[PDB]
Design a binder for these strands. Sequence first.
DNA 1: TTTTTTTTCCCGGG
DNA 2: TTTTTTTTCCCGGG
Lengths: 775, 775
Amino acid sequence: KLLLANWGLPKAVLEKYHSFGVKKMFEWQAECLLLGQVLEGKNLVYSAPTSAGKTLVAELLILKRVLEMRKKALFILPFVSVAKEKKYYLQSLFQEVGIKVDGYMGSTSPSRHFSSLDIAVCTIERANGLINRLIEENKMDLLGMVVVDELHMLGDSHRGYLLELLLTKICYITRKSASSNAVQIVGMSATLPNLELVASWLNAELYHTDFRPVPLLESVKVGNSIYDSSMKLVREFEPMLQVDHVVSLCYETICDNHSVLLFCPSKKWCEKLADIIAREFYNLHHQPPVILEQKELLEVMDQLRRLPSGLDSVLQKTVPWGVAFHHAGLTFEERDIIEGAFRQGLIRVLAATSTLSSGVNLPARRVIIRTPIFGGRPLDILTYKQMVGRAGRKGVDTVGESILICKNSEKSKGIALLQGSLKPVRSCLQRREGEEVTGSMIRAILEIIVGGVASTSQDMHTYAACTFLAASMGAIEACVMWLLENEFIQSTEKVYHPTHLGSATLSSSLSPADTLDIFADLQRAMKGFVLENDLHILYLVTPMFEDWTTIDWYRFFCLWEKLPTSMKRVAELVGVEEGFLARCVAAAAAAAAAAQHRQMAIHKRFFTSLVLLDLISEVPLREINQKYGCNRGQIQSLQQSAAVYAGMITVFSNRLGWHNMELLLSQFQKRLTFGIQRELCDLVRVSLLNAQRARVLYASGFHTVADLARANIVEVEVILKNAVPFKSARKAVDEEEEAVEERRNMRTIWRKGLTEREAAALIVEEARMILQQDL
Amino acid sequence: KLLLANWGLPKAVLEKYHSFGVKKMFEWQAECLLLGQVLEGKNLVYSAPTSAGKTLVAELLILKRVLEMRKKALFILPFVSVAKEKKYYLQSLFQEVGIKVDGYMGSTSPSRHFSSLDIAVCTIERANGLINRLIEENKMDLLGMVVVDELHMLGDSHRGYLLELLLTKICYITRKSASSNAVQIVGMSATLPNLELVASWLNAELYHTDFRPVPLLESVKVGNSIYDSSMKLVREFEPMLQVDHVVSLCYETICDNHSVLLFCPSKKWCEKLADIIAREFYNLHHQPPVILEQKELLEVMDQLRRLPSGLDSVLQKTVPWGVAFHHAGLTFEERDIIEGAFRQGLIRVLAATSTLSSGVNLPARRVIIRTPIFGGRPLDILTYKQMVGRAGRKGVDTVGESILICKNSEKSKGIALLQGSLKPVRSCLQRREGEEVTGSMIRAILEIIVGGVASTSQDMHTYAACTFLAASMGAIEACVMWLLENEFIQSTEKVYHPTHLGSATLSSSLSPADTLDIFADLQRAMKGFVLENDLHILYLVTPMFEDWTTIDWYRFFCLWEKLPTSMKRVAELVGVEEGFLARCVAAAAAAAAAAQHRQMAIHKRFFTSLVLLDLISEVPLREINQKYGCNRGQIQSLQQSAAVYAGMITVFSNRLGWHNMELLLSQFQKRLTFGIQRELCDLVRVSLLNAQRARVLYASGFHTVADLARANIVEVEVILKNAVPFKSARKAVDEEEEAVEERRNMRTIWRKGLTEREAAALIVEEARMILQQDL
DNA sequence: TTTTTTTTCCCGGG
DNA sequence: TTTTTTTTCCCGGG
């Protein structure tokens, strides 16, 4: 019955699942598994709370289908970290029978090909490209199941409409243009008010349940009253020690065994509340017991001290007690340790802005939401229900809590957020029909014409009848026109064929809207190209961010004047000019009408490209944030996104027909991949030896600094003298004084100390002193 | 004794040599072979007339040394064609025992490496690079013999001083810096007046002989008197039919069996005298017999008719009789047939400017030199003795003749040219000692410092004592300075080390003087580079010719105005400007003082680069000479020299340290190699199908035009539609009308007929008509 | 005044 | 108002 053994599973699979400690299944799982003909063929849509085991049925169905019919499967997931964890889980579970679970998430590309794989775990945007390729090459029939998580994002999002672009396409191509269920689709949502309409569109069943192992109480508190539930008093809060009374609330939670989670509305605000709690804990417990261990807490200090960026000041006066912060201004490795400590004991109190609301699974006891207004706007209903989902620890306590501290002035705002479920899911396509067509519809029809699925306008009119007309119920004729004067398709006397620009957009998969910006940058490049410095090629591969940081305009104008002579020639060629910056940095704003749109996009990518230049040329990170307004967590994200963008413009140029430019872009992929050196780490222990001098000195020495570095002085000086490019140091018959000086200040030893010969004696003398201390 | 069998030779070698029909050897060969200790070790220098067998001793010595001691050998030869003939001779002779005779001449690079070879046949400039590489890599000891032909060119020439740069270097490095003869050197000259001084410098023997199988008489004729020899009358010339009386002189030669050779002082002049003789032959022999065959003469007409350039008008009215011309304004294949006919019968009379004076071996009977003044200057003594050397046919007649037609006004000019032997050989280095150092000395010391043979100035002072001080008998100190401010070597506190620019010059081996021009062109390129068209990359690989044609300045200014918008941007970047051409083309000349030297070199390479652009883009050769003042023989030479130059700038950039530019230059080596298509020849039989459309149409059709071309019209139109690069056809927010139009006139079908769709119907209709005629 | 995520791929014998 | 000559190199299994 409910026992896992009485369900027909492989022996190794059941043993592995019992190793985790799961034996029974809830009645709702069985009810939804035996709901109609979901088990054999057909599609399924259901919505269950996240606290209850939700992936049981999905894994059972995918295992059944894979073991019965040999066909590939997809496991589209929202984020990367959850995708990696799910990939590890699936591999460790199917590590015996043999599936070769492999993930496409992030830059972790598969070592093998898609054909050898059986189950692929991908993100939202890395499955659309896979399906597009499976359409371009006639191998679509390999697909046998598509599993989608978090279905309600298909309505409206920055990247959630890809589900609505993908599902209709696969269903139409597999069934409507071909004629049991050839492709099975299952989905998960969160208590949608119109879940029936989604199931009918996909021709599926419908199961809705509401069962949680822990019955949490959303005990909203206002002032001293704990008026909650249906506006009824349950308890009265007394003023404990104070200097809102937030500190008193965490005290009773801290006492017995429990923990607190504070959701700040700002990063800094997390820091402010973290130090405040730390003061009270030490105030009257070191001069009731605080109940914390000290053997492992001091060990954690060691890990936080060995990071290259070093420990943080606010992370030293609060970590000794169970207080810290987990905002986004931390290194991915540094922020991982804070999460690890909360996983089992040690730290007790925590703070966060939004990171632990979606992306990680860290349950705890009663959760404080603090103010009910975030960023000057009312809190979203979906966000509030997401935070309170993590207000219960499974298998330890019996009940959960969720106390929202709302000021007496507002009052009704908490009640409105307390009373409400969700909103109906829109289409994003609907918006306008006779007005300007949305960017989602333009990408919809262009992405099948390039694949050749639909050629005649009559055929494509059928396609639009399977995505939105049956969903919740001219535009096509106006959408075809937009693709015409923009040179995306070509028309004969009525058959449409892809052009070279249309094929380039699909292969690289940027967008049918931002491709018009990258194309204008590459076309302007083939009229003059600076080849001495590496800034003009760093401007064509810089990632395009809508808003990644508050671009300071006073500092940008300051760095504009101090640029060298050679690097100022790239600026005039790419488009950035001083006149625009004169109007800006003077309490200005954006504008419209085409021409002003190009000006803002040109200047925004230059500031990002300037930052990326310094990371290639060292410029230690402590001084990076001093000159450029940035953050430690933002710098790391830029490095990851720069490598992916460099290798994607290369595909754009290859399909476009331009072959000479492609070689230049492909050659630069090596330098942008920073990585971490391991063998060179021993050689990098020298003061005046950067990463660029390791390779040249490794050819001869390839040893430590004690005896290898103490081998003559002429050989060492000459070896590093010939590594630099030529860079002649005499004025030509057409150059200027500034041009030659920039060619003379580059050969100086760096940073930028003495002359060439003087550094040879300094390096040898410094090495001898270091050798004596070591020995 | 004199028999070849009694000399100790391999049986196969002697049988092969007897196959050619050579049995005995003259007494001078034995005398020079048994002269001192030349046979075992030591060096040899001798001078013999070219008519007598001169290579017997050289081949005997090289065979002896190779068969005795396993060591490589070199056979430096002046020209390429003679080098190829010598390579074929040596291979066919040593085709049995096993030597692997292989030549470096021209672009015919070896398939294997130098180590596997045993005997290498190289030109003058392709052995200096080999020796430089054998110095750079410590493998000099493989050399065991160096054979030099035409030694007297070492004195003064445009490229003859390389022998004086090479011999001293090898001798010094092998003997003076190391301590029997480790390396044996043999040489051939032509009756030098100071041959003793050359032998003592190389520490060799000396043999001088004067013996010719045919005793030619230099019967100079002036007016009607044949006053010759020591100014003595031998015969009186009577006036035969006339309209100088040049035609009458050839008549008696033509009659019995003999032939005539006329050395014109100009190309055209050869044409003028060729038609004149043809008129007289037909005048009174078709209305004594002319004595010529007609079966093979008509066959020769067929070969001259199938050339791509077609037959020549002046080559049709004189070829029916034994008259033609052999100037340099002919294709290498076309001019080969004329030489082949003269090899055995058929054609009897011939004309030439200088081609048959040095480079080919075509002996004949009495030779007429015509005027004794060439190009407004007195005839060179060496040139006159070179022409009369071919005034005797071996094995047919008994005596030769050489009649120089000198007008009665000059008279003494012929006597001075008749009485005289040669002039003493200079050094080219001597010229000036305290004055500006010659370009030969700068290259001399730079070429050993880079190799590291000499480091201290004391050591190098010894080097100059082995090349010229002992030859025919401050400069070194002034020569080192010139290499200093020009950044060719670097100096320490006295030891000199090569720089990056110095190593680049030796590897590519242009010159220590013209490298300063190529470097200034590449440095100017890394400040802006046009990547759309292929003219900016065609300007950096254009061969640098001192004077290859009379550059017309009126037409150059005309083509300057008609250039498109994109191609005029390259002109401003490279240096060519309208202002300079305004002063020129107005009865102007050259100038001096550095700045004017760069201006002339910039503009001269642009005219050559414009010509090379059309050859890549078809532009049939008949119209090539109409717009550009050129010649059929000059166009072919430009194509051969362009391919070699493209692959040599690549080596220059690799050693210089600039890696991004090297990739662009290396990618262009493929297009510059025109070649001849063989498989595509069948596909090229279509009117509207050039070489670029063969590859795209070969993917689908790959057949003839009868049935393969008659396969639908949409498929054919689309296939050639997508081959062109994108080349968008809409004006951008920053472009101009002219820029867009140049992007719209390129997609038109070419040439440059109807629109894109119209050509599809025209091609199909034209193919059907051609198919009907064939079938 | 916070939270994310695209691309194709070379090395060994010669 | 004619006659010449430099350079290093990739393709197959995956």
